[PDB]
Symmetry: D2
Subunit: 213 residues, 4 copies
């Protein structure tokens, strides 16, 4: 029943902002949580719980959060399957500042349209096949690195050199090995991320049509 | 005023078939010529009339039909502006077999939506500014060459050797120098071409909305 | 022990002609077979013997000769190791017209320098580690397709349609999945191919040094 | 008489370090300044003197040091021509910390081999034709940005946000518009910059051969 839209692109490409803008333009930020018609799920909500050793390494920017193994892919698939079945689900909340899953959770009631966004949203064939539309937010790597540096220092309490070390060591290689090869599965490529008002209004209009019947 | 959609991409990327699929799905092929609400204009209709020396080289695959100068940009601008003003216009008919413009012209009546497609549709800023939406059909160069070889032999009366010679000598360099750099002006990138049904349906749905108001 | 130089690059990038130009410039074509100091080995000599079903599909351009499995990597490793040990070896002769290995084999006597070239020469780590120098011939995909079409029609008994079909279906995908990713192992990237005289002369000069001691 | 080698690549690709390593391995750092056989000239030595307004903007990372206009190209050409004529020349010394030409200068006596390195070494046809060998140090843009950030903060007294602003606004666009299109003129592409010992020893050996006669 629900129409699932998968959204991918590299880190800091604008995935989160594109999805947030779409939902805001659809007037969903005003709808009762129990009656939202369009919701956004982030693949990062499903990052795995780290062991003491792993967290230690994460604090030093030495843990690989960009490899498919960093995510609980079974939980992702099972949650998406339940959503397609019209079931109400609970989604974990991840804290990038402490590299941990919070205690609080977000309950997702049956929706008509679901946006699932993540750096590896198209990595798994099973997950891919669940999407009726696949969008890829394409932003150059150097541009994304500049955005990631500014974002991580000002929002995630990260140190510049740690960010750059983590990026060169893990983010870049994993993006090239696991994310780029999935771009070919996208139906539509969106450049300029959240500043692309034309592409965004196009998706908004399409979703509204789907909502109207 | 009519809603203009510009469509670009390299040679044989799928521009013509994408526009053709869009109007077919909109049911325009079952509407009388005078009653069509969506019409397709091709930049190739505006190739310049060749001088005798130019045609000579053209017959040997030694003329550059991929340079911006090969198109009558002044006529393109004039024609598109008149269309924007709701005027009925006559446009030339180009024959790829003879590298020449035919005697007959095509009457383009006022339509609600106009698709203008061509390898250098986004080259001119004045032209570019007339499009309310810009689409770029992105298809790999080798895939496109394959498509062009078969198409040119079967539709444009060309022979293998000349096609490859012209491609390597003029088409490839011109694409990199003049076409590729215009990709940044597109609002939406459609990979592969006419087989991309989700992207096509997104544009069809958008156009149907314009037609309904 | 002999100095081994590995050479890779996509199909028709210019690997064979680059190696051929190098030995020609070193004057090896004017030296008796037994006296040659620089020899060329092609990975294509190690294609596997096809089963009846495989040859059937091969005749229709429906067999994947671009997958690592299409080569006998065990024989390649064994042969190269023996050559490294200064042993004389016999290598197979492959016929592209019939997709089969000939009855006769070629005797490879101990040489001071060995050029081993092939589309997947850097795929195997064990093989890769035997090369003291690795060169990757980088030529654009469309340029390469053009070259392959002409070469395959004139040298490998293929017809246009089948070539393009095989290329798009197996060659292109395999290059992106298996060949392209090995480019990172090259020490030197030689663009364009055999027409790159400065790059070729650099390798010739380097080899002449090895020959002089 | 002198053999000129042009070296290009984007900012922080490793151009300076590659050239320095080559000269050091050739034993030139021990030779009397008046008798050096191999010398390195940097295109940055020829940055233009800024006006008061320009310097003000430079202090804010708002001046375009990546456009061909930022360099005194006539002085570059004339100096290279004089060097080819065996003339002794004087080369300005640039200070990145103060965005200015210093008073001190470096005198360059007749050399046998000259390495000229810069982000736009291959931009001018006249300058390009002076080179008998053209090398391009190829390093990914995101990797180069990370290196540039670390370098500018620790060696050029620049602020992080100013570096990123200057990079996004000027460096990246100019690299893509003016530098990338010159890569096609390179004879040899060198990856991994100064860590590529194989490629570096190859150039060293070639130069030594040129020096020996
Ligand atoms: N179009 C843009 N221009 C400049 N900065 C942007 C743009 N889009 C996003 N950013 C910034 O880049 C960072 C990446 O944000 P986000 O939308 O969450 O990307 P992603 O979800 O792919 O990681 C954010 O800090 C955001 O404010
Ligand atoms: N998905 C596809 N698979 C096989 N052939 C295709 C596909 N898409 C287009 N073609 C063919 O490729 C050629 C390029 O066609 P066209 O749509 O006219 O591109 P363009 O208008 O950009 O030049 C045509 O002969 C067309 O029928
Ligand atoms: N610079 C060039 N210009 C035109 N044709 C070329 C050039 N270089 C190679 N070719 C041709 O392209 C084809 C590819 O040849 P080859 O050297 O065998 O490449 P590879 O060994 O990588 O498959 C050959 O038919 C060859 O003669
Ligand atoms: N191979 C490398 N690995 C890590 N850092 C490097 C490497 N090569 C250079 N760097 C660093 O990157 C910066 C770029 O240096 P440089 O050689 O001067 O490049 P360019 O001359 O192209 O600007 C320097 O601060 C240097 O120490
Ligand atoms: N604890 C974590 C979890 C993820 N991440 C990063 O978050 C990125 C994915 O989130 P964005 O799509 O929002 O960029 C990954 O590239 C990864 O390196 C992190 O830096 N620390
Ligand atoms: N007489 C002509 C006119 C155009 N052309 C080619 O047609 C192409 C543009 O049309 P397509 O977008 O349909 O490929 C150009 O790349 C150009 O080389 C040609 O081959 N002969
Ligand atoms: N029987 C065979 C064996 C190999 N090949 C092709 O030969 C190529 C490898 O040789 P080149 O490097 O000379 O191009 C592969 O891309 C493969 O498709 C073929 O077309 N038929
Ligand atoms: N005053 C100056 C002059 C040049 N530059 C930078 O120096 C770079 C070129 O030097 P590198 O090749 O050493 O990176 C340019 O990208 C330019 O932005 C600067 O940041 N301030
Ligand atoms: Mg995000
Ligand atoms: Mg067309
Ligand atoms: Mg070959
Ligand atoms: Mg430098």
């Amino acid at each position: 029943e629900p129409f699932l839209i998968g959204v991918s692109g590299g880190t800091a490409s604008g995935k989160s902002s594109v999805c947030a803008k779409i939902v805001q333009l659809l007037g969903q930020n005003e709808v009762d949580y129990r009656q939202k018609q369009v919701v956004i799920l982030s693949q990062d909500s499903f990052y795995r719980v780290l062991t003491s050793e792993q967290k230690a390494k994460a604090l030093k920017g030495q843990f690989n959060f960009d490899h498919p193994d960093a995510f609980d892919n079974e939980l992702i698939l099972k949650t998406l399957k339940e959503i397609t079945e019209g079931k109400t689900v609970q989604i974990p909340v991840y804290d990038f500042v402490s590299h941990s899953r919070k205690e609080e959770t977000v309950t997702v009631y049956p929706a008509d349209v679901v946006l699932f966004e993540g750096i590896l949203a198209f990595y798994s064939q099973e997950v891919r096949d669940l999407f009726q539309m696949k969008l890829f937010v394409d932003t150059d790597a150097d541009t994304r690195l500049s955005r990631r540096v500014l974002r991580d220092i000002s929002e995630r309490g990260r140190d510049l050199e740690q960010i750059l070390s983590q990026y060169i060591t893990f983010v870049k290689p994993a993006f090239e090995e696991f994310c780029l090869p999935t771009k070919k599965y996208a139906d539509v490529i969106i450049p300029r991320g959240a500043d692309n008002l034309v592409a965004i209004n196009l998706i908004v209009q399409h979703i509204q049509d789907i909502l109207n019947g």
